[PDB]
Amino acid sequence: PVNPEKLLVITVATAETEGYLRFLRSAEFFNYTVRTLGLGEEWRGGDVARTVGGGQKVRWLKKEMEKYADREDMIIMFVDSYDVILAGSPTELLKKFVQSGSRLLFSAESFCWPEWGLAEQYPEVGTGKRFLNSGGFIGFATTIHQIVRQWKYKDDDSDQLFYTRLYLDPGLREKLSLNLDHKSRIFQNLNGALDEVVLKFDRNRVRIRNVAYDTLPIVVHGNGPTKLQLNYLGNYVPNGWTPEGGCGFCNQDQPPPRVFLAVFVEQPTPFLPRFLQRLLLLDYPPDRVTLFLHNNEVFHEPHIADSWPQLQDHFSAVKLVGPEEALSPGEARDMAMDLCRQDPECEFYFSLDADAVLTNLQTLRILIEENRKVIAPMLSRHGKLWSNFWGALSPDEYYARSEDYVELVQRKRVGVWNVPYISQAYVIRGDTLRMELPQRDVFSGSDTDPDMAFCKSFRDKGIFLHLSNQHEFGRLLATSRYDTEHLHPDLWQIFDNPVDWKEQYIHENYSRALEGEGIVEQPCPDVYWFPLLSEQMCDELVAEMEHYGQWSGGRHEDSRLAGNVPTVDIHMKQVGYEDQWLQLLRTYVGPMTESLFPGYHTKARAVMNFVVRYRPDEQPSLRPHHDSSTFTLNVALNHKGLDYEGGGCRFLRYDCVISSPRKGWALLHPGRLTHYHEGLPTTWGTRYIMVSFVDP
Amino acid sequence: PVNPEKLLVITVATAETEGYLRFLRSAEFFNYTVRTLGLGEEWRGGDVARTVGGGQKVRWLKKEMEKYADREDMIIMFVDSYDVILAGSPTELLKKFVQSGSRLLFSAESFCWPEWGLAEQYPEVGTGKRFLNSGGFIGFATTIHQIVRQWKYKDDDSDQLFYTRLYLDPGLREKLSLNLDHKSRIFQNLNGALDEVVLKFDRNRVRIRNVAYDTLPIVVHGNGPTKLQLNYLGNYVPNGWTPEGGCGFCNQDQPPPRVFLAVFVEQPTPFLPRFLQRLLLLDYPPDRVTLFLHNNEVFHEPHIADSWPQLQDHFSAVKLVGPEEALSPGEARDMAMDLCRQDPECEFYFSLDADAVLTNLQTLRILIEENRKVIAPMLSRHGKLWSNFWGALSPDEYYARSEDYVELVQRKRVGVWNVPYISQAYVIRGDTLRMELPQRDVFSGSDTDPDMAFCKSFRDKGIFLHLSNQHEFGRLLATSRYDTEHLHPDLWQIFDNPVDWKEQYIHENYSRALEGEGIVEQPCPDVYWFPLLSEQMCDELVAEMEHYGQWSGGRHEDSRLAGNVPTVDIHMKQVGYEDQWLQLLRTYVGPMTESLFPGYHTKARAVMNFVVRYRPDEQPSLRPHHDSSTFTLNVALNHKGLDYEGGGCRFLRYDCVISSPRKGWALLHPGRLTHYHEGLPTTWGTRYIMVSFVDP
Ligand SMILES: O=c1ccn([C@@H]2O[C@H](COP(=O)(O)OP(=O)(O)O[C@H]3O[C@H](CO)[C@@H](O)[C@H](O)[C@H]3O)[C@@H](O)[C@H]2O)c(=O)[nH]1
Ligand SMILES: O=c1ccn([C@@H]2O[C@H](COP(=O)(O)OP(=O)(O)O[C@H]3O[C@H](CO)[C@@H](O)[C@H](O)[C@H]3O)[C@@H](O)[C@H]2O)c(=O)[nH]1
Ligand SMILES: *[C@@H]1O[C@H](CO)[C@@H](O)[C@H](O)[C@H]1NC(C)=O
Ligand SMILES: *[C@@H]1O[C@H](CO)[C@@H](O)[C@H](O)[C@H]1NC(C)=O
Ligand SMILES: O=C(O)CCC(=O)C(=O)O
Ligand SMILES: O=C(O)CCC(=O)C(=O)O
Ligand SMILES: [Fe+2]
Ligand SMILES: [Fe+2]
Ligand SMILES: [Fe+2]
Ligand SMILES: [Fe+2]
Ligand SMILES: [Mn+2]
Ligand SMILES: [Mn+2]
């Protein structure tokens, strides 16, 4: 049994990057003792993500090893730090090192590099990896000193080639007992072996298993183009997310910092007035928030103009960049982000897109408390898997589904996740914009999509893109085929955005009245009365009818039964709102009717759907008649007294009169046999009603 | 101006027949002074309806004229009496006689008889009648004596030939100034001139007009085969029936005579039990009535058997002649009539057929008060023109429509009418059967129809067949295609006899409840409750269902809506009663529904009509459901407590229960949306209901 007190882990890090801190946390989880070489210094090893190099690591190790030149009692493991996480304990590590029978065990990998021609010099191995990788090795301090002290090359020379050439010396390999971890018993390099690595879960920790060799590696090395795969594994291994503990680093539980809030409207997006009004409700001191709003659509200029006085009176400062600036989305996002970068008072930058609905008013706070450089709240299309983040990339950096993507979207696993792509909503530390991403062309510069260029700019600097589903934050609006050719296009959004359509157009008490609690009334026998449409729905529907303007006249025929009984009206089929109103009937009127008439079942068929107009100059009344319907829906659309004077509906066989109709409320009565009824004359103004003969 | 006191009318009559009395009344109406020759004597003039004769008239006239042989101051008119009516006053008569310039004016007619060869000897007349008729002449008493005193022939010789030969003497015609009433200014002979004679009406008298000559004759002579045409005219001329006075001889306003009442059932006839029960209700002392009933149908033997104890206990005496006697209708009617003839105690004979419905219970009295030899009450098919009498005959003695037939049937003209044919109901004086029609073969003897032989037997004896529409007497049942292949065939008589079908099967309060007066109830909201079917209708409908016996079982489907909801039942289409029940719905349920639900209009369409059976061993209940109907008719068919124990119908949304249904009563409720309802379990016995899903 080798004493873990004799094991020392040595790594190299020229800065306390997020990858290096992720490495330290994994090492501290297993009580490793780690010595970091070169924290204050400048990396002279060259662009290691582009070419070969890393010789500066050997120079610092060689210098460090001189004081351990005679320490046969010490075992030393050298690993990278930016793309390495530890998955096993020092006891299991030293046990496996002794089992190898080696005095200096390098990591093995599938590829022979930098020089391919050296592959013939390598010993033959059956099913295991054959070639050396210098990203991780472990051995006696004396044996390691005898290897690293031969370093005498440039900082930007290849350390992999240096260790490879020494290993391929047949005499030296035999003398010092050099070996390679062929079956990944200790070191797991990810490049060329992604299909061999899977997550092995435990109650309060997560490891990886090599299914090719049935091993549980100690060191996980995301060498080469496997940085994103290591980011994925790093969200779990070793204590990132556990089945019984949840996240292992997230929160899960004085003036606040000043924030630049940037709003982007880059396409015609539904319910923008609701979004602009929602900005006033975000739970963050508005005296600490500066508002930037770029609107690329002339369709939204009136929406922005109506809300701008309230916004300017609310926030510390406001600035609108309208469509007349001819700014591309990438130029506008570069401009807003740079306004925060070039302002030392901007402590955090909050970028919120117009299709992002923030149901959680505490979103800005929660993200700032997470204390990340870049963090995004998880927002999803309602009922769908589409969301504001990607779990994986294709090699061409297009979308790909990750193994745990559906678990994250469905919030089977909650926490703060390191993901390759975020969009639509993210909070970025101001210091990071100045110290690490100082360039202007973050979203622009290339023919790639501005959102992809943004994420790729931070990945190229090793900046993690975090995503939190720790709380419910909101949803994403559908903006795909938003038909703008309407006086009020949001009336037609019942299919694409039903949740927001209900909150805007369905009466705020429809739900409460549907569960009971004594809101629905029965003013006349078997004539029920419930709130259905909001006042905004009534005003926009009436306005949409008058904008059409072609009301009924003579010769018009309706499905009424008396003794022809027409009305001056506009059918939904004429204005193209039939499919929309039939959806309202199925979703909202159908279930209400079955609750008020127990035993009846409805699919809400209705061929007759129309808005009637009553006026003293036109048709002020509607003589007694029946309806070609099982039951009739009768919704008022304006106010009595304010908009019109005159009676409503009278049911003759009961001597009962609905004299004072309520605007958004709807009447529900049988249409045949029993409820012979008549519309009382409108004596002043104009009376609008919406009526459907459902189940004919 | 010739004094009417100098005018004497002379006629011949060997008996005071109805024709002779009709002649006297017309003569007394104009204050004629009439002397009748030969009242007590026997007619030796031969069969004058078959051959030639009448010479006995001249012998009696010649003898009578000898005392007026020198009376130049006297004008004398000789006419027949049996087939003659007077239409003008003696003043107009004498004025026209003087205008003729004749001393002896014979009647003229179209035919030259008995000898045709004498036509050449007659003077030529342009447009008027050319030949002599001895049925009527008028002239001076001296001139008439010089003609009739030359009589020296047999009693059965032709008087027409006697007067013809004297007129055709050119010297004698000139000497005595003999003439013929060519243009019918005084005498109107009907034979050969029926198309020339029309009725001319006044306020309180009726005449005839000869449209060929534009004359108003004084004497109407129904010579030859025109006796029935004179009977027709005799009902009006001169004071028979007038537009302002009505009938001129009918009534229009102590133990009663003993009556033999003969009932004839010669075909399967509907509602015979109702007829037999109606015999007990005729308003005539039953101790004075003897009942004879001939039944030719074995189908009616049970009907006769059920009523026979009550009939025998009611009348003075009863006698049934059943189908086992193998009697033809003519033999049975001969037998019953002869039973009265051969009984001196039979004062009147009342023959009533089974298809005669006597609504007027005072029919036997009213007819006896009319004091006629033979009189029939007018009975008609309901709403039709077919009735129990004929107004005219074809030459082959088949039916023909008379000029006033429709006026009589529609009772535009009411009175007592002399008609050529009666049937189905008539009262015959017993004395007439003994003294004038003593033969047995009244209805039998020839291949002619027994009803026609009956009427022809009385016409051959000069007996008038009278018909009274002075009152409403009743109607005639349709017996044409009476389908007897049913357990209760009268259930299917709703089309052919709707008036009697309603009185037997429709509840006795349906009408009263339909006019209001607070019979209909509303036990549950919009569930009405009215009496519809009588108890006999319910018992016969239930019995007809069980006689079919093939009730529903598994796999049966109904037009009910819940959450399949079947019932053990029998649809009307299965038993062939659909068309019948649909007629009940149109006539009786439709109008009731429109009265109880003002504004609704119904044609009573119903594809689902069925009788449900509830039993504890079978299907005792009917779970909650709706109906494929606008409204549902629910009629009980038996008694609760007596026939079954268990609840009825429960309407869930109202917490209202029809716990105690009434047998013949029907429920009327909506079938959709509001009246989710359930049939409570029948715990004992059997519960029958009739249900229609009307207006689906
Ligand atoms: O600015 C830097 C860059 C790198 N490192 C360190 O150098 C190591 C190597 O960088 P890495 O991102 O892990 O590159 P790799 O994808 O692992 O590929 C490597 O492959 C060889 C063997 O691992 C290395 O010597 C080369 O630096 C490099 O090309 C990092 O982990 C860090 O520990 C720094 O301390 N600072
Ligand atoms: O049993 C009788 C039959 C006849 N008459 C009288 O004779 C008259 C002639 O009888 P009728 O029925 O009128 O015969 P018609 O159809 O008029 O035809 C007649 O035509 C000749 C001229 O009128 C008559 O002499 C014949 O009797 C007769 O054939 C009657 O009106 C009676 O006045 C009797 O008094 N008793
Ligand atoms: C690490 O050491 C601390 C004491 O320094 C001890 O409490 C803890 O249990 C150790 N954890 C592991 C995983 O060895
Ligand atoms: C008939 O005579 C009576 C008196 O004898 C007279 O009252 C009546 O008016 C007369 N009628 C006619 C029609 O001449
Ligand atoms: O005017 C009303 O309130 C009734 C209108 C109605 O029922 C209809 O539109 O058919
Ligand atoms: O059993 C009852 O009273 C109800 C029966 C009924 O409504 C039906 O026949 O559908
Ligand atoms: Fe309309
Ligand atoms: Fe209506
Ligand atoms: Fe059925
Ligand atoms: Fe029912
Ligand atoms: Mn590395
Ligand atoms: Mn005659």
Numbering used by the authors:
A (entry chain A), B (entry chain A): 33 to 285, 293 to 602, 606 to 738
List passages from the publication reporting this PDB structure:
MS and luminescence data showed that this single-point mutation completely abolishes the LH3/PLOD3 Glc-T activity without affecting the ability of this mutant to bind UDP-Glc donor substrates. We also solved the 2.30-Å crystal structure of the full-length human LH3/PLOD3 p.(Asp190Ser) mutant in complex with Mn2+ and UDP-Glc. Overall, the structure appeared nearly identical to wild-type LH3/PLOD3. Analysis of the electron density at the GT catalytic site showed clear signals for the Glc moiety of the UDP-Glc donor substrate. This feature was never observed when using wild-type LH3/PLOD3, further supporting the importance of the Poly-Asp loop for Glc-T activity. LH3/PLOD3 p.(Asp190Ser), matching the corresponding residue in LH1/PLOD1, resulted in strongly diminished Glc-T activity and yielded a crystal structure with observable electron density for the donor sugar moiety for the first time, enabling the identification of the amino acid residues directly involved in Glc binding and those shaping the portion of the cavity likely hosting the Gal moiety of the acceptor substrate. Whilst co-crystal structures with donor substrate consistently display no density for the sugar moiety because of uncoupled enzymatic hydrolysis or very low occupancy for a very flexible moiety, the inhibitors show density for the glycan part connected to UDP because hydrolysis is not taking place.
Multifunctional collagen lysyl hydroxylases (LHs/PLODs) possess both Fe2+-dependent lysyl hydroxylase (LH) and Mn2+-dependent glucosyltransferase activities. In this work, we have combined indirect luminescence-based assays with direct mass spectrometry-based assays and molecular structure studies to demonstrate that LH3/PLOD3 only has Glc-T activity and that GLT25D1 only has Gal-T activity. The LH3/PLOD3 N-terminal GT domain shares its fold with Mn2+-dependent GT-A glycosyltransferases, encompassing a UDP-donor substrate binding cavity stretched towards a catalytic pocket.
